Design a binder for this molecule. Sequence first.
Ligand SMILES: Cc1cc2nc3c(=O)[nH]c(=O)nc-3n(C[C@H](O)[C@H](O)[C@H](O)COP(=O)(O)OP(=O)(O)OC[C@H]3O[C@@H](n4cnc5c(N)ncnc54)[C@H](O)[C@@H]3O)c2cc1C
Ligand SMILES: N=C(Cc1cnc[nH]1)C(=O)O
Length: 381
Amino acid sequence: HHHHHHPIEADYLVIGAGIAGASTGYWLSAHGRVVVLEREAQPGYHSTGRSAAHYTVAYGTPQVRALTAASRAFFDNPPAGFCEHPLLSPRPEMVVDFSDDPEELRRQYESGKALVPQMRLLDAEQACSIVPVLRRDKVFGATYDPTGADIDTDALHQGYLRGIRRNQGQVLCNHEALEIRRVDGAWEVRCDAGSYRAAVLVNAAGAWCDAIAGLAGVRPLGLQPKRRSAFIFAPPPGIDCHDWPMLVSLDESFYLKPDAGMLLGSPANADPVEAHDVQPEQLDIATGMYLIEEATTLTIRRPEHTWAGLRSFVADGDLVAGYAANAEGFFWVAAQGGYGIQTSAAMGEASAALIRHQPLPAHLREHGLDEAMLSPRRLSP
Ligand SMILES: Cc1cc2nc3c(=O)[nH]c(=O)nc-3n(C[C@H](O)[C@H](O)[C@H](O)COP(=O)(O)OP(=O)(O)OC[C@H]3O[C@@H](n4cnc5c(N)ncnc54)[C@H](O)[C@@H]3O)c2cc1C
Ligand SMILES: N=C(Cc1cnc[nH]1)C(=O)O
């Protein structure tokens, strides 16, 4: 009984305009009519706007590391017109053993080196030379990856969205998917002012991917959102930290990285929560500050910024890009975990190819990617 606009027909409806939907949409948009439906007034209000903006190959499961490695070429050399400035800035990563676990440190070095030939094994004095605020008594060695990079996430994200629009796609904010139904051979999404129809529904809804499946009547993946908090604080007078690496503890108890002229800290937490607009917890922030003040000579007065975001995982820690079994046209782009920005070029290209029933492009297969490794079918016996 209330007015709605006539339905809009497309080839692919993408739910969510974060890095997952934007990257998938970007690679789809040259081939057909893309409509991206985003709940919020802005596309990057949830996880894509809350990251540490870093690129690190030796991080995550083997599938994650391949997706990340395979994304570098786009990031370093994107198409003409994609963006105005470089997407990556040099930022090596140093993983420091603060718990005296040489066997773990060696395992991570050998593992890392196998993918990153320039990775180095450092002794405690070498780690303290690189970040001189480290407490030598607390340091037992480190790994060092000279190939790490900071990512200009806003430029990357906006580049994907602009690409969609240049290919006559639509990116519609304030268009929460409220209902989803298979109607006359298409998926039909009701938003508050009108509905959208396409043969393909691309579920790129971040921590809400299983909620979208629940609207559609599609069996969910078992996605678990996990809260991670972070904060920005001023370095003490006299400390010039602008060229420090990203510093991470071996057991992921905290990390620390320069953010221009400030420092970004985090307790690197993973507290399981429901999908929601997540806020930082005081205990998260206090724990991160405590651990930084114990590992280093830094004293932290009060943060300039605090936030938290959701890193969402399925049971095996791997990303998901594939059609749902037994649910025609429903395509998952999910389980980005702590890796959705640094994997986005490979995930977007792969997902788009698979949506289109195409082979994975050579450069992706050469990095050891295949359809089965990405598929949600692997979560099932
Ligand atoms: C503290 C922290 C540090 C991190 N560090 C890094 C890092 O250094 N590098 C890295 O690669 N990753 C990092 N991550 C991970 C990265 O943030 C996520 O993997 C990535 O942002 C997930 O993108 P997404 O598109 O899946 O999710 P989101 O960006 O959350 O996008 C999903 C979108 O779906 C929309 N949506 C949900 N439901 C609906 C609906 N009903 N209708 C319409 N739209 C809907 C949401 O509003 C949202 O905009 C970090 C994350 C955190 C929190
Ligand atoms: N991905 C991160 C941080 C990161 C470190 N190096 C690259 N990324 C996270 O906190 O999920």
